Symmetry: C2
Subunit: 285 residues, 2 copies
């Protein structure tokens, strides 16, 4: 009752091919393991969530100055978006001119995998000063997980609550912004098709910047939400400082594996004690 | 192109005489080997890195002091030019120059001499917990080094009088066999990481990150043909692009690490092409 297991969904602002109207569509989901959604429309193989260094860099940077709304007494996604944008303006995260377009982007239709066969496809999109969507200026890199696992719901616990992670690109925004919202009571939103109530909202919006991949940033946020210690801390957090402390503990026990010319598959096994001790340090203090 | 042998040395004190000196801490030939207490080299292992180590390595490399094709054959001249360029780039004050020169010119001890010293303890420079790798690999060379190999020396120290952490990257015009520091192969690259006590900075981890960076073939080639600090920075950004982070997870360790094999093989496909 105090804490629940968390199902995480990552959704990205994308362009559909048939009508060229930008819409929210899920890209990956976390039920104790990450499943990615390919271009064909079938979920890939579940796998352990590996994070890039830059994604964790940017997650820490946007979380340090991030906006958090804890125990927010609201039930609808529109009201939550209104409150988050008001707190964004209060914290100088966004300018008041950005509010109308950010709101109009937040209540777009949240689609799922079932619409991929109906629609022509999905393409990455960037939201402009007006309502028009654009083609991203920075070079496009295909998703690594899509290239690895994609190309070829009964596991959800009954008392689990959902977490929605929304990543979007907006060229008119001055800097990337983080929005973390914990609802006072878990509420069923139209954003998630599943009958799992929503407790947490992750909103990561920003302009195109070097070393910032918003898909990878959303993956890092979702992996952090799927971590047991951070999940408990987010449930019990009463301020942004507790979330930041949990994130520092998360990064202290993260294992960074640098490039090496010879992947032997046996020198990798030499880091089993390292992984065990890092998990011990994460679980103890 | 040359094969590398990286050597990490740290500023320490000896119990018997309380004298500051540079002590062997780890070496890189093909995998990382750490020196623990009692003077026994640990098991060879993959050079895993911490998030904060690579963080601060990038931070101090961005403001790094880079000397390339330096025409010196002794450690004293390299140190003199390095602190002169430190003063020129305003990394350190001119008053700390004498003390830093005194520190960089202390005796460089090695594995064989550790037992005769009656122990070695970590030290911090004044102006006047055990390592994870030791805990997990050390509780229990010339043949391996290729003939046409050149060595890298990573010098790591703590100096409270310094205001900020300072990185100095020196590349020699010709490989030199320094008399002060004895190595099986001549020194070419010289990493100098100094600074005060600061949050999220473990200087052992900074030196390990620098040594792992220098052991990487692509960065080694780039530093061989680098002509400015920007090229080194770009190679470091590519290194971090290919860097993979494993978050703390409850999966079984063997399967958890084996899942990273295809991710690594894809992540390094165009790096070595």
């Amino acid at each position: 009752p105090g804490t629940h297991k968390v199902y995480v969904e990552l959704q990205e602002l994308v362009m559909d091919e048939k009508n060229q109207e930008l819409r929210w569509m899920e890209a990956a989901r976390w039920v104790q393991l990450e499943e990615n959604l390919g271009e064909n429309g079938a979920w890939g193989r579940p796998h352990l969530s590996h994070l890039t260094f830059w994604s964790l860099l940017e997650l820490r940077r946007v979380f340090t100055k991030g906006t958090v709304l804890l125990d927010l007494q609201e039930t609808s996604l529109a009201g939550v978006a209104n409150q988050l944008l008001d707190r964004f303006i209060f914290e100088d995260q966004i300018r008041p001119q950005d509010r109308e377009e950010l709101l109009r982007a937040l209540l777009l239709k949240h689609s799922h995998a079932g619409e991929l066969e109906a629609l022509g496809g999905v393409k990455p999109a960037v939201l402009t000063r007006s309502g028009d969507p654009s083609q991203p200026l920075l070079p496009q890199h295909s998703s690594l997980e899509t290239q690895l696992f994609c190309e070829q719901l009964e596991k959800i616990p009954p008392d689990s609550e959902a977490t929605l992670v929304l990543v979007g690109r907006a060229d008119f925004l001055e800097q990337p912004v983080l929005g973390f919202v914990r609802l006072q009571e878990a509420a069923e939103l139209e954003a998630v098709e599943l009958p799992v109530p929503i407790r947490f909202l992750f909103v990561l919006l920003g302009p195109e910047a070097p070393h910032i991949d918003y898909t990878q940033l959303g993956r890092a946020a979702a992996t952090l939400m799927s971590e047991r210690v951070f999940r408990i801390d987010a449930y019990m957090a009463q301020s942004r400082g507790e979330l930041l402390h949990s994130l520092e503990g998360f990064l202290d026990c993260s294992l960074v594996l640098p490039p090496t010319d010879a992947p032997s598959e046996q020198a990798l096994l030499s880091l089993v004690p390292v992984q065990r001790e890092l998990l011990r340090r994460r679980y103890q203090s």
